Amino acid sequence: QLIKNGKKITAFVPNDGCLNFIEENDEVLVAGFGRKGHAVGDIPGVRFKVVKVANVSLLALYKGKKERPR
Amino acid sequence: SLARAGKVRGQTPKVAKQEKKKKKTGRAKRRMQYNRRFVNVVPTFGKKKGPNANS
Amino acid sequence: LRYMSRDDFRVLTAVEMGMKNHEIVPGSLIASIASLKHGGCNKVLRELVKHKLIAWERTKTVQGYRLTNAGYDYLALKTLSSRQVVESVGNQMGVGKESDIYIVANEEGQQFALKLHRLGRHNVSWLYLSRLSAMKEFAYMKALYERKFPVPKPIDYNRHAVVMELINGYPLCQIHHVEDPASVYDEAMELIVKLANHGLIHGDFNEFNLILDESDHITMIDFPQMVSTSHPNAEWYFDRDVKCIKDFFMKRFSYESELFPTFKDIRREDTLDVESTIPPELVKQKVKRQLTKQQKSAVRRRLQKGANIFTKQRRENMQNIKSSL
Amino acid sequence: SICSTYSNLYNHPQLIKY
Amino acid sequence: ELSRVDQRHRASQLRKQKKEAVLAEKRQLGGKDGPPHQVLVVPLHSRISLPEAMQLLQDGTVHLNELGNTQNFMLLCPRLKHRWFFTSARPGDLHVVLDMAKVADTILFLLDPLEGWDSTGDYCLSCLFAQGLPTYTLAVQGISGLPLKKQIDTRKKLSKAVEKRFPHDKLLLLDTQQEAGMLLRQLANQKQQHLAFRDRRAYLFAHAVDFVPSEENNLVGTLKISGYVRGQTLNVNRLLHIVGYGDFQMKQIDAPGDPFPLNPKVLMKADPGRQESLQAEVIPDPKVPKGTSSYQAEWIDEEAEAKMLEKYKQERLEEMFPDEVDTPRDVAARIRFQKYRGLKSFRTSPWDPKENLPQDYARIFQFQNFTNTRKSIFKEVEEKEVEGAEVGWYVTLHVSEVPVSVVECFRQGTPLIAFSLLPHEQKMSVLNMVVRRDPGNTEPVKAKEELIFHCGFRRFRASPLFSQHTAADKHKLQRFLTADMALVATVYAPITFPPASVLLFKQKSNGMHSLIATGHLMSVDPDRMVIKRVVLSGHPFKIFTKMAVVRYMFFNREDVLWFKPVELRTKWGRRGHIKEPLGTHGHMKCSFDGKLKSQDTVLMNLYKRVFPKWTYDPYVPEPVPWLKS
RNA sequence: GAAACCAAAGUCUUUGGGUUCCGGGGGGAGUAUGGUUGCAAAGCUGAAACUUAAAGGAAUUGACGGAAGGGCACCACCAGG
RNA sequence: UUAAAUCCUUUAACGAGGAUCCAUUGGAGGGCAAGUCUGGUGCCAGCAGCCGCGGUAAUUCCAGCUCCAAUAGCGUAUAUU
């Protein structure tokens, strides 16, 4: 649920086991998928992907470069 | 019903990276890219082999 | 045996829907007519091929699945389980040429006999001819039991399966001696006159279609061959069956007949030879039916793209061409 | 006798009701 | 919205809603109505002396409170209109740091200039990050103690050293009283990270503790914890848990005079007998000739280090191979795997959650619907008001049954924090925690190993069961804690309400607690079944098309006959099931879907339900300061 | 000219004789809503949210016809042993 | 140098042998430059802008090795040409 207006969004969490980093009631930076508003490839009705969890990037957390605070 | 999260990441054996000598960088690397392609040319009848081609 | 008891009903019935109209049914059609679960039916099909439930067909262009002999058998037993007639399997099985006899047991523990038609043109036609055979046999079985005949009691019919009363004994062909030959002979001769009274001729009334119960009671089975008395050669099939029994008791038991029944009685009994105005509740149902049909048509076209086999064949040749150049 | 059991449901945790 | 002005008016209304919501949250803290602003300080590197900067930090008005070893103080000024209460902790001393950062509103990290932080500091930093950071502020000391030529480059070198933990945060230096004033100002006006556990409960930090023994020979009496209520409205009928000493029912609350107000005896409530929440952790009520045979009759110091290397090899055998266990040839296989069954499919095939249960389950409490009770309890805290003492009030608590050791260690230095337990939090259940392994340690950790848990404000030893973190009913047991996987630890523990941070420690040597795994608390229920698997290997040595002969899977004849309904599978992907047993030795004919390779291995999976060991004790020893080997 | 075809559907990358209407992947949808005309039924005008890798036009071989004609076979029948 | 400094420039001394004073980010089926290499996984996890890859020999996933493109930069989302 976005902060700046309050709309609900389904947002795809990218790499495998990256869902485990994201916990309920956490700050999440969401971005577009790539196609400006199309559901990209396989996933139906999902336009957005998670980029950061609690101000650290998923790309770092997967690669084991940083720790996630809570 | 089903749905593991990151099954294949935790099942794969954690293989340690081998220690190789450092690669040359910049002009030095480009020099080596030039000499590997245009200088020591080995004759072939039709050329069907690639640069990375493993078997 | 039957362990899986949810998705296996819906998938196998969907095959039977396509079997009535077409030969080999594609996997694209199956999921559309079984809309309760989407996507995960393809792994169910891979569990069905483990058993003798369905067969795969990938000839040249035709890609899909067809129902097997044993796979058609499981569907009837699954329907009979819901009607509370079949629960466990009895092992005494007399494997024949036209049909298989299976012992079945209910919730009570009472043992009944089950007939499964095994007619063996493509397999699609063979599993349709078995459907008409059971419906015809059950029709005669109901008709005779109601009219005082010593036949097995009809219980239930499902596609090709027929549940009957368990009369246990030996067929007349494998009988050495009978304690009272005369009383058994007169019982059998009465039953030919009985059928002729109801306007029926057995046609093949032999020692191969009669079973003795404790050498006292004669039981009749197998009824797809029966003919009307309106037939021009009605007395010929009548006399041939009489002479078949007349000679048999003289051959096996050395009993010569004192009574010679040759009466034509048609018919003193039943002729068995024939045998703001629109409420919002309705509006909701009608709107639902429209919206489901729009979704089902779109899912069909999504599944029709599965061609996956066409893409696999094209990829193999391209790798060979680039390597040779 | 093979891989079949009667295993009784006789001991369970006390559950807080809603 | 339409219309230029009407569109703007919409935005103007929403500003006034949000600004009122913000003003509501900030007036609750540090002032005339709110409590104090509790600030914890941690110097991370060993070089840093905290009294050097803490003497700059003190000057408004000071009120120097004191303990045995630790020296924490109150700061009060009407210039900034903000009440403070500072607390200082040494990293490595895990016991103290965590227990008083879980009440601290703000953490202030001190950093050395030439290096980033110490390895000892990094240890405490990994714990604080995972148990839940409040609001962090980074500070330095040796910056102005250097020439201008180096001072520019020193702050740049720090930024790169910091980025690997704190991604983007400003560093405020502490050298002058003017610099420290800038820091205080920054700590006061700050966006508060509301920690979820603290907000739904009601807690106290101890400012002063008095002990009145009923009988000195009994060594148990009445405690007098005086401090500020910070969480929610404190209800006397509810139980109270003191962090390191367990939970006990309290007698009386009283509200004396606030010792330090911003701008300068009577009891609030006595506890009734019936409305009182009860101290009950577990369930109360518990003819043949002479010589002829049977065949013809039918016609008629270094020990632990050796054990460590055994564990290292066991971990390798259970990472390369799933759960391959060799069948014993001495004992019968149907006897050794008595309680085991075969599943057709681990995902689908049914398993009763109330089937064959242990006697230890008839000692805990289940939830009829956990989430519905969780919503009901959380509503009755937020939307309801009770007759108790509000937040900001300086109170004193009287607790009926409390040991002497509580006060003894308080006067030594260790702080007391006491939080009011919610309804059904004294009772025990089966707690489930999803928890990933920390990259710090690489010690092999076995399944039923005794570990130290930190399930949010609680501390205990327990023997967990690690599992797959799935959405299905059955969960596969993991015999070792993997370095990258997220796993569910299942243990008998007194029922706490999510969300709660969960840490796992292990007693090393000399009494050093080593952080192995960090996570959080998931749903708490005993119905979540953990299943232990055993994979029995066999060998296909005679192979015909579709049917093959397998040996070394069993050794008896009726071993094969016992596991007849168990469906086999194969390393190269073939799915089969046994047909006939042949030999008196363990040989079997087996049907398959396809033809097996000679290079193949046949294997069947056996499953049993496993429940955790009852090894709950609330007492956990104080660890010594942590160091690197 | 994609082409079947077209002396126009030609004189078009060698692109400009005058001039009116009108289309811009398929759906949603010629639906809602507003306006207007209509006694009414309706007409004219006329969206969006959202969904989908396609929707289609020409031509071409003929896997399959539950299409038709022939021809052949005691691994088919007929008359038989 | 400069208000005074800093930086640059100018200069004494010390400062380089590969386990260093160690270069990164993306990718390696096609589009599109570069592996039918090895292990793991088995329509699962996942990847994939699109076409698609995965249901036991995976050139497409997770790794290892190897190679390619850009190079102190390089990915990703969005507005726009």
- The DSSP code sequence of C125-137 is HHHHHHHHHHHHH
For A69, the closest of E129, E164, E485 (CB atoms) is E129
Q: How far is the CA of C22 from the C1' of F65 (A)?
A: 14
Chain B positions in Cβ-Cβ contact with residue E482 (cut-off 8 Å)? 10
> Does the beta carbon of E366 lie under 8 angstroms from any beta carbon of chain D?
yes
> Does the beta carbon of E285 lie under 8 angstroms from any beta carbon of chain D?
no
Tokens read off for E69: 């070893």
Helices (H) and strands (E) in chain B, counts: 2, 0
Tokens read off for E338: 């008595």
Chain E positions in Cβ-Cβ contact with residue C45 (cut-off 8 Å)? none
Chain B: nearest CA to A19, how far in angstroms? 7
Q: How far apart are CA C150 and CA C148, in angstroms?
A: 7
Interstrand relation of E513-521 and E501-507 (parallel, antiparallel or unpaired): antiparallel
| 3-state secondary structure (DSSP) of residue C280 | helix
Query: What CA–CA distances, in Å, run from E541 to E6, E563, E591?
Result: 85, 20, 14
Tokens read off for E326: 């060799």
Q: How far is the CA of C290 from the C1' of F45 (A)?
A: 30
- Is E483 in Cβ contact with B1 (below 8 Å)? no
Helix axes E119-131 and E94-101, enclosed angle (nearest 10): 40
| 3-state secondary structure (DSSP) of residue C71 | helix
Q: How far apart are CA E66 and CA C99, in angstroms?
A: 98
Chain E: nearest CA to C237, how far in angstroms? 51
Interstrand relation of A28-32 and E575-581 (parallel, antiparallel or unpaired): unpaired
Q: Which chains touch A (3 or more CB pairs under 8 A)?
A: B, E
- The values of phi and psi at residue E492, to 5°, are -75, 115
> Does the beta carbon of E344 lie under 8 angstroms from any beta carbon of chain C?
yes
The burial of E305, by beta-carbon neighbours within 10 Å (0-12 exposed, 13-18 middle, 19 or more buried), is given as: exposed
The burial of A54, by beta-carbon neighbours within 10 Å (0-12 exposed, 13-18 middle, 19 or more buried), is given as: middle
Task: Evaluate whether B42 touches A49 at the Cβ level (below 8 Å).
Answer: no
Q: Establish whether the linkage from the previous residue to B13 is cis, with ω within 30° of 0.
A: no
Chain D positions in Cβ-Cβ contact with residue E372 (cut-off 8 Å)? 18
Residue type, E309: L
- Asked if residue E313 keeps its beta carbon closer than 7 A to nucleic acid strand G, the reply is no
- Which residues are within 8 A (CB) of C10 and not within 5 positions of it... i.e. 6 or more apart? C34, C36, C37
Q: How far apart are CA C37 and CA C40, in angstroms?
A: 7
Task: Evaluate whether C226 touches C203 at the Cβ level (below 8 Å).
Answer: yes
Q: With left for phi above 0 and alpha for psi between -120 and 50, is residue E295 left, alpha or beta?
A: alpha
Q: How far apart are CA A13 and CA A26, in angstroms?
A: 14
Long-range contacts formed by C295-303: CB under 8 A, 24+ apart = C296/C32, C296/C35, C299/C31, C299/C32, C299/C35, C299/C38, C300/C28, C300/C29, C300/C32, C303/C27, C303/C28, C303/C29, C303/C31, C303/C32
Helices (H), A11-65: 58-63
Task: Evaluate whether E79 touches E86 at the Cβ level (below 8 Å).
Answer: no
Partner residues linked to A57 by β-bridges: A52
Q: With left for phi above 0 and alpha for psi between -120 and 50, is residue C324 left, alpha or beta?
A: alpha
Cross-sheet strand order for the sheet of E106-111: E61-63, E74-77, E82-88, E37-43, E106-111, E135-140, E171-173
Residue E413, Cα to own-chain centre: how many angstroms? Answer: 25
Query: What CA–CA distances, in Å, run from E296 to E292, E299, E300?
Result: 7, 6, 7
Count of other CB atoms within 10 angstroms of residue E244: 19
Q: With left for phi above 0 and alpha for psi between -120 and 50, is residue E331 left, alpha or beta?
A: beta
Residue type, C107: E
Query: What CA–CA distances, in Å, run from E280 to E249, E272, E358, E494?
Result: 10, 17, 21, 11
Task: Evaluate whether C205 touches C225 at the Cβ level (below 8 Å).
Answer: no
Task: Evaluate whether E399 touches E235 at the Cβ level (below 8 Å).
Answer: no
Which of C196, C205, C214, C291 is CA-nearest to residue C241? C205
The residue whose CA lies nearest the C1' of nucleotide G19 is B19
The answer, yes or no, to whether E and D have at least 3 beta-carbon pairs within 8 Å is yes
Partner residues linked to E240 by β-bridges: E248, E420
- Is A55 in Cβ contact with E499 (below 8 Å)? no
Query: Which chain C residues 11-70 have CB under 7 A to strand G?
Result: 39-40, 42-43, 46
Task: Evaluate whether E594 touches E584 at the Cβ level (below 8 Å).
Answer: no
Probe site for chain A from B2, B7, B9 (most A CB atoms < 10 A): B9
Residue E603, Cα to own-chain centre: how many angstroms? Answer: 37
Q: How far apart are CA C206 and CA C184, in angstroms?
A: 14
Q: How far apart are CA C118 and CA E413, in angstroms?
A: 89
Task: Evaluate whether E467 touches E488 at the Cβ level (below 8 Å).
Answer: yes
Chain A: nearest CA to E196, how far in angstroms? 9
Task: Evaluate whether E452 touches E507 at the Cβ level (below 8 Å).
Answer: yes
Q: How far is the CA of E319 from the C1' of G47 (A)?
A: 25
Chain B positions in Cβ-Cβ contact with residue E468 (cut-off 8 Å)? 4
- The values of phi and psi at residue E22, to 5°, are -70, -45
Host H or E run for residue C162: strand C161-164
| 3-state secondary structure (DSSP) of residue E300 | coil
| 3-state secondary structure (DSSP) of residue C248 | helix
Which of E561, A23, E417 is CA-nearest to residue D2? E561
Q: Which residue is closest to E341 within chain D, CA to CA?
A: D3
User: Which technique was used to obtain these atomic coordinates?
Assistant: cryo-EM
Chain B: nearest CA to C79, how far in angstroms? 28
Nucleotide in closest CA–C1' contact with C22: F66
Chain E: nearest CA to C56, how far in angstroms? 14
Terminal CA-CA length for chain A: 18
Long-range contacts formed by E147-150: CB under 8 A, 24+ apart = none
Chain A positions in Cβ-Cβ contact with residue B7 (cut-off 8 Å)? 16
Q: DSSP letter at E251?
A: E
- The values of phi and psi at residue C281, to 5°, are -65, -40
Terminal CA-CA length for chain E: 66
The answer, yes or no, to whether E and A have at least 3 beta-carbon pairs within 8 Å is yes
Q: How far is the CA of B33 from the C1' of G69 (A)?
A: 13
Q: Is C204 considered catalytic here?
A: yes
Catalytic-role residue among C7, C100, C186, C204: C204
Annotated binding site of C for ATP: 115
- Which residues are within 8 A (CB) of E153 and not within 5 positions of it... i.e. 6 or more apart? none
The residue written with tokens 């168990």 in the block is E566
Chain breaks of chain E after residues with C–N above 2.5 Å: 59, 264, 286, 300
Host H or E run for residue C101: strand C99-105
Interstrand relation of C88-95 and C63-67 (parallel, antiparallel or unpaired): unpaired
Which of E171, E170, E169, E173 is CA-nearest to residue E144? E173
- Is A64 in Cβ contact with E196 (below 8 Å)? no
Q: Which residue is closest to E346 within chain B, CA to CA?
A: B2
Count of other CB atoms within 10 angstroms of residue C181: 15
Helices (H), chain C: 7-19, 27-33, 42-48, 69-82, 123-145, 181-197, 234-252, 280-303, 308-324
The answer, yes or no, to whether B and A have at least 3 beta-carbon pairs within 8 Å is yes
Q: How far apart are CA E429 and CA E524, in angstroms?
A: 7
Count of other CB atoms within 10 angstroms of residue E343: 18
Per-window interface: B 1-55 vs A, CB < 8 A: 5-10
Residue type, C111: Q
Q: DSSP letter at C173?
A: G
Chain E positions in Cβ-Cβ contact with residue A67 (cut-off 8 Å)? 126, 129-130, 165
| 3-state secondary structure (DSSP) of residue E164 | coil
Q: Which domain holds residue C153?
A: 72-164
Q: With left for phi above 0 and alpha for psi between -120 and 50, is residue E23 left, alpha or beta?
A: alpha
| 3-state secondary structure (DSSP) of residue C171 | strand
Q: How far apart are CA C195 and CA C225, in angstroms?
A: 14
Annotated binding site of C: 115
- Which residues are within 8 A (CB) of E554 and not within 5 positions of it... i.e. 6 or more apart? E327, E333, E538, E560, E563, E586, E588
Nucleotide in closest CA–C1' contact with C298: F52
Q: How far is the CA of A45 from the C1' of F49 (A)?
A: 14
| 3-state secondary structure (DSSP) of residue E546 | coil
Nucleotide in closest CA–C1' contact with C306: G52
Probe site for chain A from E128, E136, E165 (most A CB atoms < 10 A): E165
Tokens read off for E328: 């014993």
Which of A36, A33, A27 is CA-nearest to residue A55? A27
The answer, yes or no, to whether B and E have at least 3 beta-carbon pairs within 8 Å is yes
Task: Evaluate whether E101 touches E109 at the Cβ level (below 8 Å).
Answer: no
Interstrand relation of E250-254 and E267-270 (parallel, antiparallel or unpaired): antiparallel
Strand F neighbors by CB, 7 A: A 37-39, 44-45; C 21-22, 59-62, 301-302, 305
Report the CATH number that the domain containing residue C83 is assigned in CATH: 3.30.200.20
Tokens read off for E355: 């089937």
Q: What is the largest CA-CA distance in chain D?
A: 42
Interstrand relation of E513-521 and E428-437 (parallel, antiparallel or unpaired): antiparallel
- Which residues are within 8 A (CB) of E464 and not within 5 positions of it... i.e. 6 or more apart? E447, E448, E449, E451, E489, E490, E491, E612
Q: How far apart are CA E506 and CA E521, in angstroms?
A: 19
Residue B50, Cα to own-chain centre: how many angstroms? Answer: 12
Q: How far apart are CA E169 and CA E135, in angstroms?
A: 12
Q: Establish whether the linkage from the previous residue to B9 is cis, with ω within 30° of 0.
A: no
Chain A positions in Cβ-Cβ contact with residue E130 (cut-off 8 Å)? 67, 69-70
- Quote the Cα angle for C71-C77-C81, to 5°: 145
- Quote the Cα angle for E349-E353-E354, to 5°: 130
Nucleotide in closest CA–C1' contact with A47: G77
Q: How far is the CA of E148 from the C1' of G10 (A)?
A: 22
- Which residues are within 8 A (CB) of C254 and not within 5 positions of it... i.e. 6 or more apart? none
Chain D positions in Cβ-Cβ contact with residue E367 (cut-off 8 Å)? 15-16
Chain B: nearest CA to C41, how far in angstroms? 15
| Binding-site residues on chain A for chain E (CB distance < 8 A) | 17, 20, 23-25, 55-56, 64-70
Which of E542, E534, E594, E600 is CA-nearest to residue E571? E600
Q: How far apart are CA C23 and CA E190, in angstroms?
A: 75
- Nucleotides in chain G near protein beta carbons (<7 Å): 5-7, 18-20, 22-23, 26, 28, 34-37, 39-53, 55-56, 58-59, 61-69, 71-72, 76-79
For A67, the closest of E126, E196, E501 (CB atoms) is E126
| 3-state secondary structure (DSSP) of residue E181 | helix
The residue written with tokens 């067909």 in the block is C57
